[PDB]
Amino acid sequence: MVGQLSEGAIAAIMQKGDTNIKPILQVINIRPITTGNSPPRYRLLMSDGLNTLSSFMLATQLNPLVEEEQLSSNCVCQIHRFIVNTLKDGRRVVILMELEVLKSAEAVGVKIGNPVPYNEGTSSYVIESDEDLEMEMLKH
Amino acid sequence: MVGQLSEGAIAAIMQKGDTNIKPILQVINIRPITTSPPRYRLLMSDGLNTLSSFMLATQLNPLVEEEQLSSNCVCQIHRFIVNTLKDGRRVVILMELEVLKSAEAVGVKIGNPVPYNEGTSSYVIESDEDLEMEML
């Protein structure tokens, strides 16, 4: 149900920098990032039911949630503490510092609603994720 | 040092579908796709161009888990295949390769290669964003 998500949280985060709103978001996709020999970091495409936004990153202390598959595509999360940063190239990113998984992916089962990208950066993420899946699927 | 890579191999693969060459390429970035059996996408350089549509055959995954195939290492490809997909994207699947020099032996990205095509340019921009997001 879309109504159980924090409608408008993505727009408020991006345009006003709201950090106190404890948003309830669905994880749409997780992109592991493996730089050099370093342990992975996880970038997230998240949905508030209306929009998706791809500029989320998990703080390192939340990495075990992804490894344990507690935090996986289609689960629903309540974010407790997050910070907004503008990178040196102007891109606005959101670091998730503390959260709770409210519903596992299997309980939700699938993507909630039909959210659309909040910006071109997010549509570029969606394109690359679509590319990944296409390359992935060797057998038909 | 760029002359130590197979300059022009990416253009040969993409335009002519030449899989008889045994090109020497540098890994610029490796990324697992799923978050299941891992599957690795690679941004590779031939000294002139980068190309982001390389994927690793599952049987080469041990080289990645052993951290032998890693960003900045230089490899020689022994068997590969290139296909266009129904939607027109071209994908290169690396089937057999040897790591010639470790990431540490090479030490840095060789030269200043440019993206072969728009898809690679977007991939580099997105991967540079990924990295900027980490270093926070």
Author numbering:
A (entry chain B): 1 to 123, 435 to 451
B (entry chain A): 1 to 35, 38 to 123, 435 to 449
Paper passage:
The heterotrimeric Replication protein A (RPA) is the ubiquitous eukaryotic single-stranded DNA (ssDNA) binding protein and participates in nearly all aspects of DNA metabolism, especially DNA damage response. The N-terminal OB domain of the RPA70 subunit (RPA70N) is a major protein-protein interaction element for RPA and binds to more than 20 partner proteins. The RPA70N domain adopts an OB fold with a five-stranded anti-parallel beta-barrel but has very weak ssDNA affinity. Its primary role is to mediate protein–protein interaction with its basic and hydrophobic groove and a side pocket, as first shown by a series of studies of RPA70N interacting with p53.
WRN has two tandem RPA-binding motifs with the same sequence localized between its nuclease and helicase domains. We fused one WRN motif to RPA70N, and the fusion construct crystallized in space group P212121 with two molecules in the asymmetry unit. In the structure, WRN 435–451 form a continuous α helix and insert into the amphipathic groove of a symmetry-related RPA70Nb. Residues E439-R31b-D443-R43b-E442-R91b-E445 form a series of electrostatic interactions, and WRN M446 and L449 contact the hydrophobic patch formed by RPA70Nb L87b, V97b, I33b, M57b and I95b. The N-terminal part of each WRN peptide helix interacts with the RPA70N peptide that it fused to. WRNb Y436b fits into the side-pocket and forms two hydrogen bonds with RPA70Nb R31b. Compared to the RPA70N–p53 structure, the direction of the WRNa peptide in the groove is reversed and the positions of WRN Y436 and p53 M44 are different. The direction of the other WRNb peptide bound to the side pocket is the same as that of p53b. ITC titration of the WRN peptide with RPA70N yielded a KD value around 11.6 μM, whereas M466A mutation increased the KD value to around 37.4 μM. Mutation of the conserved arginine residues in RPA70N (R31, R41, R43, R91) greatly reduced the binding of RPA70N to the WRN peptide.
